[PDB]
Write a protein that holds these residues in place. Sequence first.
Motif: not given
Lengths: 118, 118
Positions: B96-108, B77-85
């Motif tokens: 359980g989540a393995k990793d995380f992305i943050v908005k605004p999304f960086q493609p790389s 599981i990859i969680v999507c987060s906002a700034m400050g979350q």
Amino acid sequence: GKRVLIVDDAAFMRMMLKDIITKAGYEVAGEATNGREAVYKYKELKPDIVTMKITMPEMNGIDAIKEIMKIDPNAKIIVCSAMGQQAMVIEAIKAGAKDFIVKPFQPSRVVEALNKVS
Amino acid sequence: GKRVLIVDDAAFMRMMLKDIITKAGYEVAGEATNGREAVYKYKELKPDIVTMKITMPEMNGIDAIKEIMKIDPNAKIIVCSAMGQQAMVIEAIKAGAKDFIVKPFQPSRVVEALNKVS
Ligand SMILES: [Cu+2]
Ligand SMILES: [Cu+2]
Ligand SMILES: [Cu+2]
Ligand SMILES: [Cu+2]
């Protein structure tokens, strides 16, 4: 058949198409950007349906349609055209194309062309 | 693993998410919009990966991770987060989540995390 080969010169036009047709319950089998890639992805993907743009580099859409039917007499091709490409649309239908949508298209207008051919 | 379940509250974030992951050779197994859909749909689509947003109308991302973890202990599981979350993010990794992305999304940055869970 839900699986669509989208063949288009313009990225913005592949994306819209991907987004309209997958919204309407279709599976984008794949994509292509010229007539030469179109025929190759077709042997590969065996799509039920193809959307083909006329004006493309290297190999234009009508030549793509011609090869595709010699390869598969039963292909189901929808041609994407601009305003003022009525003559070319006709050559498309002559060469095999079953229907046509025109840019800029109504999302319902693209869905029914798909539906009419299957 | 090429097939991702994308679960996000907002359509703008999914299509974007879908646009980037399908550009990188991952196939959208499907999509979801709240935690309850996240957990049915996951039993259903058996996806290799899930991108999960935390704050959902009424099943939040964290409980989806917990429910999904009881269902499949080796989920990725990859969680999507906002700034400050960052707090909510930790509970995800905690749950359980393995990793995380943050908005605004960086493609790389989005592609990087996905591969990392391979
Ligand atoms: Cu090849
Ligand atoms: Cu190939
Ligand atoms: Cu087009
Ligand atoms: Cu899109």
